[PDB]
Design a protein around this nucleic acid. Structure first.
Ligand code: K
Lengths: 124, 71, 105, 88, 106, 71
RNA sequence: GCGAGGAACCUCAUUUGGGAUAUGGUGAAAACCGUAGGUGCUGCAUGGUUGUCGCAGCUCGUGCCGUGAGGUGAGCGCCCACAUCGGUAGUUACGAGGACUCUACCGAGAGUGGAUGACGUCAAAUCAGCACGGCCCUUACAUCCGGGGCGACCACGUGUUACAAUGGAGGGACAAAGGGCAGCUACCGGGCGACCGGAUGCGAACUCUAAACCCUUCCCCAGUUCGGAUCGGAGUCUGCAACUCGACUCCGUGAAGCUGGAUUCGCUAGUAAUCGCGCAUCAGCCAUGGCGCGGUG
């Protein structure tokens, strides 16, 4: 029916339903070419498909939270682990390029007595 | 400025004294000068003294404390 | 990190050097506009090869590359002009021609 | 601090509660030549939020009615229910 | 917590209403009573009693104008491994004395 | 017809033991005050006050510190 | 940019003056008339809290060495949050993919941030948060109220805007985390606009939350379509009252300012630099401050 996976990056959660088809990636009931108008953002989301697989899958994506770079990176991670479920022989091809590893870095909390996290007031 | 729905802020006791009216002493520094005040000597408090003010038509529409500096 | 139009990490590193204020797509647009101007005005090889040759014309190899990129960007800012890309294209053409205040400085 | 401070605060609260009805009746209408006949203490604009026990007029907290120093003292002592100390 | 009531976004008129033997507080008050009665330093008797009836570790700190001297001082009296806590105030003719008591056996 | 019971306290173990259940998100408040009683700023500590809420439903028909709303 | 995380009145301690120790009339009010307390002194008398020293060595016993001052077996140096996956819950969340809140393992193979601070010197700070030894005020250093002051005019510290094309303006397209709601507000019109006047949900997984970015056009190096100080006019709120001395919205006016000498300050990654959003106190607000939250990086 639909191979399912999830991706997270900063405060952005992506859900992928990969089914057999011919391209036509739809995100949030909107086309991928109209939801992400930047060619860099479309290259990140559709990166692992071109690494191995494009034009042979129909993908529906639900996005929530974060910004445009957070969501595009979160969407890339979700697709990467959805492709390894379809074939267990594609794991080394995706890990070598560094696609299945989740980056856990999130915005650090602001410590008291300082205007920012690691920035201190000017002493002089 | 004071909203037009409320009208001018004129002290009722000072207005009554002026209408019934010698220099008239007062502490009403925030009272707005009305056209009925014209021709009168009002001694406004300033903190330690009573500065006299002779009301003329040009001053109409200004607070009484504008013509009595404190510092 | 891969470049979005060429796929070379050197382009991404150069855009990182160019980056101001945390705005990276602006630096990418400036670099691509300068690479287009380097072909529209003057211009043998492609724009990417010309830029690589200019970098070569302008100690660890990584440190050498970083200092070359920093010098090129600094002298691009130093030279006059209205648009930053319109300026920087002059540095690429001038480093290809091996002249100017940028070379050997 | 002091005692006259608390005494006049209580007097102001009593006068405000006494005159809370006529002031609202005059304010709902357009009357203002009589709204200035009320005593200045009767208006609720002269109601500062002092600490309930010490009487400090700064650093007030609305939830507990106490200043920050008293809040820290009672939170360390366990007197305030629920409030704990963050482990981080 | 000492108080176990529930206050939902409102604690006023409730905190105000609240305001209006190896047990830490009891031994602290005993030491304060001895200090008010001028029985010197008291803390040695408390430590001996705790060790006699089974305290793993006891620490006592006394601060203030000890023995009527014109200077302040804080000395520790620690017995046991010490690998709960109480505070007491004694009003003497030379001022106020603060007694901090720690028992680590529980 | 149904009866919904909403429990809320400041102790998760207390509400869990009281409720003999959908766990609602908690409401955590953070208070920041100066450690010193005087001008020494930039030295603060954080006090957390948490509220835990639970919901249960009975279709077609407690320790201190818990408030329960029945609807 | 501190106690102060809300000085128009009150706070208020400071100054000048008037008092005291049911209705009328007189009054600026307090008040008048008839029918124990100290926010006073002493932090070099204190308790309790705080900052620094900024820290690896702090104590309890035996023997031995020295005429002596001295030298040399036991007690002590974790927690919270974030990542991955695996079992239970389903409403005001989207029948179990996420959220939400409870548990269990987490490299012998192919961590970070924060809080704890036994170990400390500064006669370090705090009698104005709070108690308190001593001294000094009682016809006044006590007490009530109006009107003023804490906001008046060269040096230093801390910041906010800029000095511009990696930019300003106009018109369209974007998609967040946390935190508030007797107050925020769905919707209709008076309005250029600040918000007023009719009504609607909501005491809380109904209501306030984006901008930087992505397109299109103008400006083309000009003290300018940069900049937004100062000053004149109109107003909208709050409040008994906005003159000294509030915020906001329109219309004008348009200042210094061309990237900054000697020197000096902050950090080593979701970090600096940037962009917006929220909260505490609060009728209103001086909030460009303090405390947090997320985007790109
Ligand atoms: K007030």
């Amino acid at each position: 029916d639909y191979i399912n996976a999830i991706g997270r990056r900063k405060a952005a959660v992506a859900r992928v339903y990969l089914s057999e088809g011919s391209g036509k990636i739809v995100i949030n009931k909107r086309e991928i070419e109209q939801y992400f108008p930047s060619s860099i953002l479309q290259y990140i989301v559709k990166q692992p498909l071109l690494k191995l697989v494009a034009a042979k899958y129909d993908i529906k994506i639900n996005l929530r939270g974060g910004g445009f770079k957070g969501q595009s990176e979160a969407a890339r991670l979700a697709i990467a682990r959805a492709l390894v479920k379809i074939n267990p022989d594609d794991k080394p091809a995706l890990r070598s390029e560094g696609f299945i590893t989740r980056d856990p870095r999130v915005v650090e909390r602001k410590k008291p007595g300082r205007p920012k996290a690691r920035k201190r007031f000017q002493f002089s | 400025s004071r909203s037009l729905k409320k009208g001018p802020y004129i002290n009722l006791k000072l207005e009554k004294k002026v209408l019934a009216m010698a220099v008239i002493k007062t502490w009403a520094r925030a009272s707005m000068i009305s056209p009925d005040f014209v021709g009168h000597t009002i001694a406004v408090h300033n903190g330690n003294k009573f500065i006299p003010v002779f009301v003329t038509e040009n001053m109409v529409g200004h607070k009484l404390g504008e013509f009595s500096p404190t510092r | 990190l891969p470049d979005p139009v060429y796929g070379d990490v050197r382009v991404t590193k150069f855009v990182n050097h160019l980056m101001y204020d945390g705005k990276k797509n602006t630096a990418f647009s400036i670099f691509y506009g300068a690479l287009d101007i380097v072909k529209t005005k003057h211009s043998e090889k492609s724009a990417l090869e010309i830029w690589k040759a200019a970098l070569d014309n302008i100690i660890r190899p990584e440190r050498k590359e970083s200092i070359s990129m920093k010098n090129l960007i600094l002298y691009a800012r130093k030279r006059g002009g209205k648009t930053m890309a319109d300026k920087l294209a002059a540095e690429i053409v001038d480093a290809f021609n091996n002249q100017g205040a940028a070379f050997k400085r | 601090a002091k005692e006259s401070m608390k005494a006049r605060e209580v007097k102001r609260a009593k006068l405000v509660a006494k005159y809370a009805a006529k002031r609202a009746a005059l304010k709902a209408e357009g009357n203002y030549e009589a709204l200035q006949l009320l005593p200045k203490n009767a208006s609720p604009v002269r109601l500062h939020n002092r600490c309930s026990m010490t009487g400090r007029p700064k650093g007030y907290m609305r939830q507990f009615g106490i200043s920050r120093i008293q809040f820290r003292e009672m939170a360390s002592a366990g007197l305030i229910p629920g409030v704990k100390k963050a482990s981080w | 917590w000492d108080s176990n009531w529930y206050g939902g976004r409102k604690y006023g008129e409730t905190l105000l209403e609240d305001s209006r033997e190896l047990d830490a507080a009891i031994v602290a008050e005993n030491i304060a009573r001895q200090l008010e009665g001028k029985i010197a330093y008291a803390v040695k008797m408390a430590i001996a009693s705790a060790m006699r009836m089974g305290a793993e570790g006891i620490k006592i700190q006394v601060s203030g104008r000890l023995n009527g001297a014109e200077m302040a001082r804080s000395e520790m009296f620690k017995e046991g491994r010490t690998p709960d806590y109480a505070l007491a105030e004694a009003l003497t003719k030379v001022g106020l004395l603060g007694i901090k008591v720690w028992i680590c056996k529980g | 017809q149904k009866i919904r019971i909403k429990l809320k306290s400041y102790d998760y173990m207390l509400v869990d033991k009281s409720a003999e259940p959908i766990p609602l998100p908690t409401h955590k408040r953070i208070f920041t005050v100066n450690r010193s009683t005087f001008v020494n700023k930039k030295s603060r500590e954080q006090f957390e006050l948490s509220s835990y809420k639970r919901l249960i439903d009975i279709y077609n028909s407690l320790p201190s510190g818990v408030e329960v709303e029945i609807k």
